[PDB]
Amino acid sequence: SLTVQTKYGPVRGKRSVSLLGQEYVSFQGIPYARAPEGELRFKAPVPPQNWTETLDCSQQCEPCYHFDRRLQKIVGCEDSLKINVFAKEINPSKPLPVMLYIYGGGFTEGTSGTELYGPDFLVQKDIVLVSFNYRIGALGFLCCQSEQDGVPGNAGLKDQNLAIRWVLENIAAFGGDPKRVTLVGHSAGAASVQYHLISDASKDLFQRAIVMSGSTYNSWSLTRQRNWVEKLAKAIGWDGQGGESGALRFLKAAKPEDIVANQEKLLTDQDMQDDIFTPFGPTVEPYLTEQCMIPKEPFEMARTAWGDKIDIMIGGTSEEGLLLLQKIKLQPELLSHPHLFLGNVPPNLKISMEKRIEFAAKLKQRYYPDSSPSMENNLGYVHMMSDRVFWHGLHRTILARAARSRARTFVYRICLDSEFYNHYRIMMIDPKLRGTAHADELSYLFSNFTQQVPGKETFEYRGLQTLVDVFTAFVINGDPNCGMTAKSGVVFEPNAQTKPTFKCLNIANDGVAFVDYPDADRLDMWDAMYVNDELF
Numbered sequence: 001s002l003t004v005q006t007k008y009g010p011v012r013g014k015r016s017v018s019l020l021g022q023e024y025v026s027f028q029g030i031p032y033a034r035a036p037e038g039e040l041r042f043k044a045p046v047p048p049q050n051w052t053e054t055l056d057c058s059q060q061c062e063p064c065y066h067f068d069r070r071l072q073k074i075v076g077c078e079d080s081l082k083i084n085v086f087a088k089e090i091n092p093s094k095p096l097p098v099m100l101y102i103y104g105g106g107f108t109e110g111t112s113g114t115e116l117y118g119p120d121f122l123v124q125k126d127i128v129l130v131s132f133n134y135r136i137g138a139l140g141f142l143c144c145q146s147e148q149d150g151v152p153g154n155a156g157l158k159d160q161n162l163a164i165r166w167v168l169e170n171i172a173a174f175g176g177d178p179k180r181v182t183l184v185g186h187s188a189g190a191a192s193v194q195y196h197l198i199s200d201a202s203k204d205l206f207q208r209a210i211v212m213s214g215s216t217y218n219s220w221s222l223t224r225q226r227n228w229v230e231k232l233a234k235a236i237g238w239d240g241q242g243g244e245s246g247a248l249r250f251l252k253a254a255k256p257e258d259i260v261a262n263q264e265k266l267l268t269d270q271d272m273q274d275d276i277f278t279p280f281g282p283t284v285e286p287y288l289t290e291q292c293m294i295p296k297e298p299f300e301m302a303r304t305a306w307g308d309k310i311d312i313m314i315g316g317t318s319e320e321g322l323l324l325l326q327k328i329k330l331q332p333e334l335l336s337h338p339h340l341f342l343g344n345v346p347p348n349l350k351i352s353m354e355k356r357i358e359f360a361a362k363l364k365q366r367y368y369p370d371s372s373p374s375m376e377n378n379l380g381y382v383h384m385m386s387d388r389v390f391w392h393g394l395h396r397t398i399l400a401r402a403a404r405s406r407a408r409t410f411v412y413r414i415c416l417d418s419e420f421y422n423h424y425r426i427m428m429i430d431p432k433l434r435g436t437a438h439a440d441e442l443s444y445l446f447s448n449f450t451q452q453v454p455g456k457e458t459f460e461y462r463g464l465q466t467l468v469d470v471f472t473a474f475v476i477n478g479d480p481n482c483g484m485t486a487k488s489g490v491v492f493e494p495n496a497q498t499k500p501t502f503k504c505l506n507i508a509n510d511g512v513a514f515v516d517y518p519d520a521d522r523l524d525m526w527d528a529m530y531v532n533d534e535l536f
Helices: 155-174 188-198 228-237 243-251 256-262 298-304 320-329 353-367 379-404 423-429 440-444 459-477 520-528
Strands: 003-006 009-012 014-017 023-031 066-068 073-075 082-087 096-102 128-132 176-186 208-212 311-317 409-414 503-507 514-516
Touching: 003 155, 073 256, 082 155, 096 155, 096 188, 096 459, 128 155, 128 176, 155 176, 155 188, 176 188, 176 459, 188 208, 188 298, 208 459, 228 243, 228 256, 311 379, 320 379, 320 423, 353 379, 353 520, 379 409, 379 520, 409 440, 409 459, 423 440, 440 459, 459 503
Parallel strands: 096 128, 096 176, 176 208, 208 311, 311 409, 409 503
Antiparallel strands: 003 009, 014 023, 023 082, 066 073, 082 128, 503 514
């Protein structure tokens, strides 16, 4: 009464009781790829081999290798390319719309586990939630330029492609409707969605998408190759012999715990002034396979995106930049660094050094007209980092949709500022701070390990239900209007302007509203640095 046939074998899930009270069928750890093990390490994913014996998926699986920062421990397993189905029940005769989730984690960490991405809140509406593991860091994004070596790159993105291909081919038997799939992603997970939207390799595999605080227009979404395959082999303790090819087979020989340990560790150039966020991330592939995700420059891929023909919802939070203070609590006075401003003028502009000098002055006057950056006078830098790192990419994505897509584009802004419920800002950043930070909003969508729940008279509860309602509203009929928006007398309309800005649903403590983006003036300034460069 809880066994399902997948295309590769039989699968038995569990039944359970939400943090709210409702019951739901759960399946966890369903293979969709053969363990990228041994020889297949670093490589594109291949299906699993058929298995005849009913496999237990009543318990969560281990994540793809990484440093789990909540534990401060390396963790994982290489055989972790498994997928997860949550739903109130299985109706193979009433096929429900699918929400498919892709986790974030800077392409370096992340997990599909119900300890950050709890289905309790979302399984109340009538959808099918899906979530899955894809490989991260070097293990998922190593790039060997010799075709001889079979590591083109982007193995993690290809893991996500396969996963989507699986939801299509299987979800029918969990009560899913493979032709009503919404792809949803946060941070790197959002940048991932948008690569699926702009790459032909993920063409028409889904119908709608929600893009959260992440974009192909953020510079951190694409890595440049700078001899990373060897710099890592070296740092791990490699003789120097064999070229890149020879560093690879040493890496195929290394404990993955070592790969992880040394990954981000000894890597970046310091010419990350030229924004290299990470070096095991998405890359333009050196040659073409059938599984290829990124054949050429993303910027150009975007101009002819299959995705421009489907509806999407996109947004982020009001103080995304809070993420960036982390690095600032560890060696402050980097806010007194005198290149603090001039090193946030985007590196790759075809502008002279005098313009660049001039732009960084406009940044001072915007974010710190008269006062000095410091751990106590930080809002200006949080705004700066919010714009540079997240929103300018979101905004370009919105402008580009308005120009070249005749689809609907819905824009949101999360402002929920709670003293206890904004978990990521509170646990991972600082219990001191206010504002809405990168991934705060995920507390209002997913249950997590805290088992925490605001108690129905609190505005936090109003927030929870509002998001859950608009996101599932969109997942169900490509229309984000719902009960909660109604009982504030607002209509979430798709965006229909760029000047003076775009219009978004602003979800605040005190409810919702459909307004001009309130921080437009800042982003005008970022647009203006792009005066000799094409925005989209």
